[PDB]
Amino acid sequence: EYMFSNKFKARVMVSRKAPEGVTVNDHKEDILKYEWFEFILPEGNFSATMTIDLMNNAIIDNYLEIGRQNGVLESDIGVKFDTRNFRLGWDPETKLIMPGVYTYEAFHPDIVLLPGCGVDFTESRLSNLLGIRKRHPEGFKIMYEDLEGGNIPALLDVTAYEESLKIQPLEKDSKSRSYNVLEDKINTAYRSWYLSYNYGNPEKGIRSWTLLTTHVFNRFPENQILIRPPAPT
Amino acid sequence: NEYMFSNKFKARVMVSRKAPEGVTVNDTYDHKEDILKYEWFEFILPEGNFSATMTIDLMNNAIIDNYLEIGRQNGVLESDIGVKFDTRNFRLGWDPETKLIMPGVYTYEAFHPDIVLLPGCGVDFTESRLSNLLGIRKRHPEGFKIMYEDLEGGNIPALLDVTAYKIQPLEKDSKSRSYNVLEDKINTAYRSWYLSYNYGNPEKGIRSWTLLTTSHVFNRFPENQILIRPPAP
Amino acid sequence: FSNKFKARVMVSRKAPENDTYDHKEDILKYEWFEFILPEGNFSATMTIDLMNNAIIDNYLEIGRQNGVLESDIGVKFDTRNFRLGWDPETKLIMPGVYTYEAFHPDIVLLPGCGVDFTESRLSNLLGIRKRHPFQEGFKIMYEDLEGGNIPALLDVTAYEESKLKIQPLEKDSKSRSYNVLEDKINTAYRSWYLSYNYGNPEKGIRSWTLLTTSHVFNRFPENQILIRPPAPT
Amino acid sequence: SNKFKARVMEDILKYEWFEFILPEGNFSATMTIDLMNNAIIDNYLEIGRQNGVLESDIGVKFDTRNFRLGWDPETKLIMPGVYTYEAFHPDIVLLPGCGVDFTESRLSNLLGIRKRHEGFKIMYEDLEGGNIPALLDVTIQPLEKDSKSRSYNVLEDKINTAYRSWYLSYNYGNPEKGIRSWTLLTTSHVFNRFPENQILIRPPAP
Amino acid sequence: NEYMFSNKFKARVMVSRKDILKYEWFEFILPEGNFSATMTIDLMNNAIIDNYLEIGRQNGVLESDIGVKFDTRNFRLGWDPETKLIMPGVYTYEAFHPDIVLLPGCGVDFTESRLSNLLGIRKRHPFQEGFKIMYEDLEGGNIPALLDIQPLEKDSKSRSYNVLEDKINTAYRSWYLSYNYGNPEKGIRSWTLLTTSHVFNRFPENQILIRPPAPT
Ligand SMILES: [Zn+2]
């Protein structure tokens, strides 16, 4: 009867420590622990942008009670709801985002994930408001492993290319938050459902079983991944 | 009657605030011993078809006009008004460790019309249709009075003293108006219907018998974060 | 001609028939005219600008050349709720200016003036109607708006430097008389909206009228009564 | 096809009729008015300007203002010195010898100007009583020229202007002898080449 | 069919520049979604440029020789019948109707595409089973050159505007100009119909390649 309506579940990072014996040296922390939680939003009829802001606020509210106090970093959040088309300013030769910033235009609500994380909309109605549905329907869980081909490309170090030409990716933000650039030095550890749906394998990736359909809310103004998503105009 | 005035509501507010009829009041007399007297009134708004924001403005202006007539001349402070209609989701920027609103100000975004109350106060919508315009209805319908004791778990958290960030709450606004911080110095005496509905006990709080649905003279306290003019949707 | 209204306005201000003469004995004459607006399908707020322009066009044609002042216009259509900002103890508009928010189209009148909507459809567009079809004809005169006197504004420059000199403002910036009366709280201006809402509910203008839903246009930007009415939204 | 026909042009004055063509599309009233003025000016820049006609004798303009708004009954002029820049209804402004013809056009029905009936031709002689009052030189005499020395076409008596407008003759002309007897008012920078001329300024948008 | 990309089109652009120039057809695919005409035009231009950044650019083709641009402006608005140039010096920045701008050797094909309906460009006759719009079909739709009495031959960043002989018109042709100003019974108007409908601004100084204006 009188239960909660705007709700979803997700798997986030809870702990980030060293091996049981290791002690801080002169990395950061190697052992990572993840756990499922149920996130509850305040009731009401919200738009997609307002729902996305509240969903991100629930993820960060979890990070502030169990995690920040257990060693996890802001660069390890691992679940974010966005609206951008990453890799928009992508260059085929340098394989980096040349403008140095992801295009700040709203295209379609999105799910950005880090390794070991995911979301589950089996008992939720927010997937429909976000226009992300199951193509053929029991169970709706989108994990990091299901988003093959949807890796977010790394941004160019524009401060560096303008020191001469040195093309290199940007490894940290203004406040020294890791952008999670990988060994290939072209891609980022973040994966997004929108990139895997449009740029992944059309008959084997996330598109084969999903369907695209029709300030406290900006705690990381410097981080290009955690920035507040743009609103549709 | 065709002259019923239509836009009206009843509420209980503070009338007096007089130190006990006694002997002395040194510079070390606890003003928690101040005797507080309350009374019921019927408030009438001008006739017209107003939006929810304009209705909230006129409902708040009716509360203040009563304070200017009776309470102001009987020792009641502007920090003891006791009935305010808002649209914000207080405790948005709340931190589970410090237990304070870290931005120092409540998030100035409109979510849903809200009723904020101080101890001894309340509103009554038994003979009024303004609650339907405010999207606050009875779940199981004879009588609709929402009092301070009915908003358990909806206490508004205290704001962080950002000019001194130490980790203490702000206890006065810029014009030296008491924010009504309590013992433990994390929460405030103000309770809100929206908080008790969403963050209170689901089966014992205000949510069990009220329902959330869809529906400068107006800024006399620009300095005070509690009595500030509500944001517009 | 579709849009047209009738109104009684002042036509002459002259002595009965030395700087010792008191101009409270000036002979004042009023006359009925029919004011016609350009044709079209206008909004209420655009209609109000045209109806006031018709009043001024008559003042420039006869009244101005016959000794009447801009303080004696006597018919103005507004949208404000005057006496918002009224204080129950000082009985003045403490902000020193009337609230510039549109509430409902209003009729403001001076002694001896009035408006007649017997052969006019503008009263329906302005949301002002007769409550019963007992007698044909629709005329609202200054004598019917008892209890709808517009309170006077506070002399803020005297109240602010006193620190208390709580006295009404008796003239505007360009030295236009606000027509303040004895007791120095109220004004000779009356409004239908104030008498409708704040007058006697069973004997005032409410008993036979009904409220329903709805720079040449700013020739007196300094005068708080003749200022261009605010637009909705 | 969105088209219409109109008549357009130191001492002698020539006049000639033409057919003006608009680019195809479904446009609003403001964009339609801008295209029709550009079609008039485009005709002046080819046949006319090179033949001794001045920018003070264009003769056809589509506006939205209510000229004579700031009119004073004593001076018989527009005291603000500028016409009120508010949109009231799309209008047709004409000079002597000019006119517009909507006999094959559907653009008048979009501008809310229809015949109560045929054929629909509106000439300067049909707008009797719709003369635009002259502005006031603010320094009691009418302003005779614009900032760039463009004649406002002031007439004798120094109160009225040679420009006539359909809206003024419809609302302030004779109700049973003017343009109102057979027309009806209904509901609906390349486009600003004369910023100084109060008559030729880009019409305001609703 | 179910997983087929919906927002796609085919076009012929420049691939090699070494002068003899070579062109080839490609199929451009847009991200899925229901986008407006304004937002779709930005994605179609990004697909053309993304192809230039891959095939081309490495082979000597210039940003002057891009050759497929989707616009919304009415070029030749500020055109003068005597000087035959755009006297304001810039094309009018008002949105009229989505448009196709082409250079010699280029073209677009909407035979297997639903984007022509969203761009308000339809076939006037179901007689035709294909819908290809080439540079040779836009006769009379040359975009006039800008003034400064001489035409502007390069952009602000030294990009050739591709001004031609006679120094009045440009090598760029547009469907909207050929539709409204070309031969009514011989140009593109005879078999097409006009109907109702930063990474997106990589050439801010180029008047031809500037981001198209948005309606209203
Ligand atoms: Zn009755």
Author numbering:
A (entry chain B): 13 to 38, 42 to 152, 155 to 181, 195 to 244, 283 to 301
B (entry chain E): 12 to 152, 155 to 178, 196 to 245, 283 to 300
C (entry chain A): 16 to 32, 37 to 182, 195 to 245, 283 to 301
D (entry chain D): 17 to 25, 44 to 151, 155 to 176, 197 to 245, 283 to 300
E (entry chain C): 12 to 29, 45 to 174, 197 to 245, 283 to 301
What does the paper say about this structure?
The crown domain comprises two highly flexible regions, called variable loop (VL) and arginine-glycine-aspartic acid (RGD) motif-containing loop. To expand the scope of ADDomers for new applications, we engineered ADDobodies, representing PBP crown domain, genetically separated from PBP multimerization domain.
ADDobody with minimized VL and RGD loop sizes (ADDobodyXtal) was crystallized. Crystals grew under two different conditions, one containing 0.1 M zinc acetate and the other devoid of zinc. In this zinc-containing crystal form, ADDobodies also adopted a pentamer; however, the pentameric rings are not stacked on top of each other. Rather, a zinc ion mediates the interaction between pentamer rings participating in crystal packing. The zinc ion is coordinated by four residues from four different ADDobody chains: H151 donated from one chain, E13 from an adjacent ADDobody chain of the same pentamer, and H151 and E13 from the juxtaposed pentameric ring. Moreover, the structures imply that multimerization on the level of the pentamer in the ADDomer nanoparticle may not be mediated by the jelly-roll fold domains alone, but that the crown domains also contribute, given that the ADDobodies were found to form pentameric rings in both crystal forms, in spite of being monomeric in solution.
